[PDB]
Amino acid sequence: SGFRKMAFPSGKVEGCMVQVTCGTTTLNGLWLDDVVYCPRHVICTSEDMLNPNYEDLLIRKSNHNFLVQAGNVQLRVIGHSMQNCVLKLKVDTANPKTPKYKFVRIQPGQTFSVLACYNGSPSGVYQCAMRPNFTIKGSFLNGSCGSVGFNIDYDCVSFCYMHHMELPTGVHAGTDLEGNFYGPFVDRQTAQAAGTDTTITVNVLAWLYAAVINGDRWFLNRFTTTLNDFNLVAMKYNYEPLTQDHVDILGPLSAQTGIAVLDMCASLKELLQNGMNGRTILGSALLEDEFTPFDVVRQCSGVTF
Numbered sequence: 001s002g003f004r005k006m007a008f009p010s011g012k013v014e015g016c017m018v019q020v021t022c023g024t025t026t027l028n029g030l031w032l033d034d035v036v037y038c039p040r041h042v043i044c045t046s047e048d049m050l051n052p053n054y055e056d057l058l059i060r061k062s063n064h065n066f067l068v069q070a071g072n073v074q075l076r077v078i079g080h081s082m083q084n085c086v087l088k089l090k091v092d093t094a095n096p097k098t099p100k101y102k103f104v105r106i107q108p109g110q111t112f113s114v115l116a117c118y119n120g121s122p123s124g125v126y127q128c129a130m131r132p133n134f135t136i137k138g139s140f141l142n143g144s145c146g147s148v149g150f151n152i153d154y155d156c157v158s159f160c161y162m163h164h165m166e167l168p169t170g171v172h173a174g175t176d177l178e179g180n181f182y183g184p185f186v187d188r189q190t191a192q193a194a195g196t197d198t199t200i201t202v203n204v205l206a207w208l209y210a211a212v213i214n215g216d217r218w219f220l221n222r223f224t225t226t227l228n229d230f231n232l233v234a235m236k237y238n239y240e241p242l243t244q245d246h247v248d249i250l251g252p253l254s255a256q257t258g259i260a261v262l263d264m265c266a267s268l269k270e271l272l273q274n275g276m277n278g279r280t281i282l283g284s285a286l287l288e289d290e291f292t293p294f295d296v297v298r299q300c301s302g303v304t305f
């Protein structure tokens with residue numbers, strides 16, 4: 001019993017963090033086999049941000065311009081390389097601590113654990129969701145860039161995020177491990193803004209199921225609805241459209257609780273149109289959309305890694 005925001009254990013990923021310096025610019029990298037992955041903007045000083053010609057900057061970078069450090073150990077940098085927004089530094093030394101891992105690309109709505117790091121040293125672990133506007137509500141200070149986001153499949157680390165920038169509103173953007181941004185952003189200092197955000201409907205539903213499971217069910221009622229009847233009511237409260245794909249995945253939680261997705265939906269319609277009426281749900285005074293279905297099975301069934 002209980003239900004918390006909950007991150008994967010970070011130890012598998014702690015052992016992969018290094019500190020990359022390049023002139024004045026120190027940030028964090030991810031050491032796997034004989035290869036460190038970091039943001040290409042490590043080559044840049046605070047000047048170069050306005051319109052960086054990354055190529056012609058990197059063309060003037062000797063491998064002895066790149067310092068790498070795993071704790072108290074320096075590596076010999078031997079080969080560089082640029083792929084999209086991620087720079088690949090090649091080192092004499094494979095990483096003893098390298099776990100099994102697939103570079104993957106999450107879609108908006110999917111959650112992951114962020115290991116905030118500074119100077120290649122881990123500070124903290126927390127959960128976020130890739131927002132539908134392709135941003136994240138992180139906590140990052142200067143030097144955080146290179147910090148990565150990740151999920152775990154028993155023993156395999158699926159890295160899905162490298163951190164690159166803060167947007168006007170105090171929200172954050174970055175890339176997959178191939179160095180492609182989530183959403184429309186670019187890695188220079190221009191006018192860029194998040195764009196309008198929506199509530200991750202399927203995740204809010206999973207939350208409610210999690211709530212039912214932990215004996216919180218005042219919010220329940222004696223009716224149902226249809227998808228499209230609901231998808232009307234949702235858009236008028238700036239919720240995402242609930243796709244048959246989203247019902248499929250909510251399957252397990254529907255099964256276990258003995259509640260049809262579409263009955264829960266009706267309980268949502270109520271809450272949007274009426275509020276919580278001075279009440280909490282799993283001790284929250286508004287609707288939580290940063291727990292996926294899997295994160296709810298994970299935590300209430302108690303999977304391990």
Ligand SMILES: *[C@](O)(C(=O)NCc1ccccc1)[C@H](C[C@@H]1CCNC1=O)NC(=O)[C@H](CC1CC1)n1cccc(NC(=O)OC(C)(C)C)c1=O
Binds near residue numbers: 140144
């Ligand atoms: C990241 O590059 C980083 O940590 N770099 C190392 C560093 C060392 C010493 C001093 C500064 C930075 C930062 C991380 C940012 C800063 C604070 N919180 C973060 O998430 N990213 C940037 O600085 C980023 C790099 C650009 C994409 C390639 N950047 C540069 C310039 C401006 C902004 N953002 C911005 O102007 O928004 C507000 C909040 C309005 C300042 C930016 O994110």
Ligand SMILES: [Cl-]
Binds near residue numbers: 283284285286
């Ligand atoms: Cl709250």
